[PDB]
Specification:
This is part of a larger assembly, with chains A and B. Chain A is of the alpha+beta class. Helices cover 22% and strands 35% of the residues of chain A. Chain A is globular. In chain B, 16% of the residues lie in helices and 0% in strands. Chain B is mainly α. Classes of the chains: A alpha+beta, B mainly alpha. Chains A and B meet through helix 1 of A and loops of B. The PDB classes it as motor protein. The entry lists the keywords axoneme, outer dynein arm, post power stroke, dynein, motor protein. The entry is titled "In situ outer dynein arm from Chlamydomonas reinhardtii in the post-power stroke state".
């Protein structure tokens, strides 16, 4: 997520990561990033 | 007087003067000096547009 946040950050400095979702072949990974805390949920694709 | 005595007699304190001369010499000394360059450290810097 930190590496992913920088990728979003390089294109526009003002823009900051709000939500990131990575979908794998067998599972879906959703990560919500905040400075104080980060929430990560893994949900199997239906 | 014998000839040998006359030769000895010919030499006189005023006739022959002996002076001892020496040259000042600094005393030899042995000293060891070690030089070692300032400590160097490894630095890693990463720069990004957002940073």
């Amino acid at each position: 997520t930190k590496k992913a946040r920088s990728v979003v950050r390089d294109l526009d400095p003002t823009n900051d990561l709000v939500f990131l979702r990575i979908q794998t072949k067998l599972n879906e990974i959703m990560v919500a990033p905040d400075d104080e805390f980060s929430l990560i949920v893994i949900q199997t694709k239906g | 007087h014998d000839e040998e005595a006359i030769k000895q007699t010919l030499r006189n304190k005023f006739n022959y003067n002996t002076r001892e001369c020496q040259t000042i010499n600094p005393s030899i000394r042995e000293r060891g000096v070690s030089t070692e360059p300032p400590p160097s450290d490894t630095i890693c810097g990463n720069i990004t547009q957002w940073e």
